[PDB]
Design an enzyme around this catalytic site. Sequence first.
Site, short mmCIF file in Angstrom:
data_model
loop_
_atom_site.label_atom_id
_atom_site.label_comp_id
_atom_site.label_asym_id
_atom_site.label_seq_id
_atom_site.Cartn_x
_atom_site.Cartn_y
_atom_site.Cartn_z
N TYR A 15 -21.33 63.66 -21.49
CA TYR A 15 -20.24 64.62 -21.39
C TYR A 15 -20.73 65.99 -21.77
CZ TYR A 15 -19.55 63.51 -26.32
OH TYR A 15 -19.70 63.37 -27.67
N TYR A 23 -23.81 65.97 -24.23
CA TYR A 23 -23.70 64.99 -25.31
C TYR A 23 -23.73 63.57 -24.71
CZ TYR A 23 -22.13 68.68 -28.49
OH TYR A 23 -22.02 69.78 -29.30
N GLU A 68 -18.93 58.90 -41.07
CA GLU A 68 -20.35 59.08 -41.09
C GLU A 68 -20.86 59.18 -42.54
OE1 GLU A 68 -21.38 62.37 -38.30
OE2 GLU A 68 -21.25 60.64 -36.93
C1 FER Z 1 -17.32 75.21 -28.46
O1 FER Z 1 -18.20 74.62 -29.44
C2 FER Z 1 -18.49 73.28 -29.64
C3 FER Z 1 -18.48 72.62 -30.90
C4 FER Z 1 -18.78 71.23 -30.92
C5 FER Z 1 -18.88 70.34 -32.10
C6 FER Z 1 -20.12 69.88 -31.99
C7 FER Z 1 -21.08 68.99 -32.66
O2 FER Z 1 -20.96 68.45 -33.69
O3 FER Z 1 -22.12 68.80 -32.07
C8 FER Z 1 -19.12 70.59 -29.74
C9 FER Z 1 -19.16 71.27 -28.54
C10 FER Z 1 -18.84 72.62 -28.50
O4 FER Z 1 -18.84 73.32 -27.31
#
Ligand code: FER
Length: 162
Positions: A15, A23, A68
């Site tokens: 995603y 991710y 976690e």
């Molecule tokens: C807009 O900012 C973001 C913050 C997070 C939180 C992320 C993590 O823990 O990796 C994830 C994606 C993002 O786009």
Amino acid sequence: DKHDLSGFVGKHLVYTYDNGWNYEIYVKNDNTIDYRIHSGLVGNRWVKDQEAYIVRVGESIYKISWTEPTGTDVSLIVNLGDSLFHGTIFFPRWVMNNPEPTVCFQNDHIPLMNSYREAGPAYPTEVIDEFATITFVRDCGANNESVIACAASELPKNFPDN
Ligand SMILES: COc1cc(/C=C/C(=O)O)ccc1O
């Protein structure tokens, strides 16, 4: 059947937030996940064998929640039919201040995460609450240790790559 996780166990999901960061979640079994973060303040952090609460909340919509060793709490929605991800993360204050000490293969450093957890301040909690787009889905079967087996920095720069 809200108790049937057939459609979800074995899922390997890429995603992608609106800023383009990728991710990964691999749903290893009915109570376990692997994950891998590519980019951002906690980029290259990854985790195997995270015990989680995995439920079904719609026809092809699933929820995964866990806690976690850093003190962080997570609750996510995977809506497969609408290609829609939504994540809520409850970060301790210490993680917002120094996100880099969580960047590791966490499985090799669980005592260290607990030590940081006990120390730097827990509070105030930061809630990060955000949609992303499901950009790739595969099925890899349950208990497959080869899905997430290196840091994102070891993957092809091409990623994702089927
Ligand atoms: C807009 O900012 C973001 C913050 C997070 C939180 C992320 C993590 O823990 O990796 C994830 C994606 C993002 O786009």
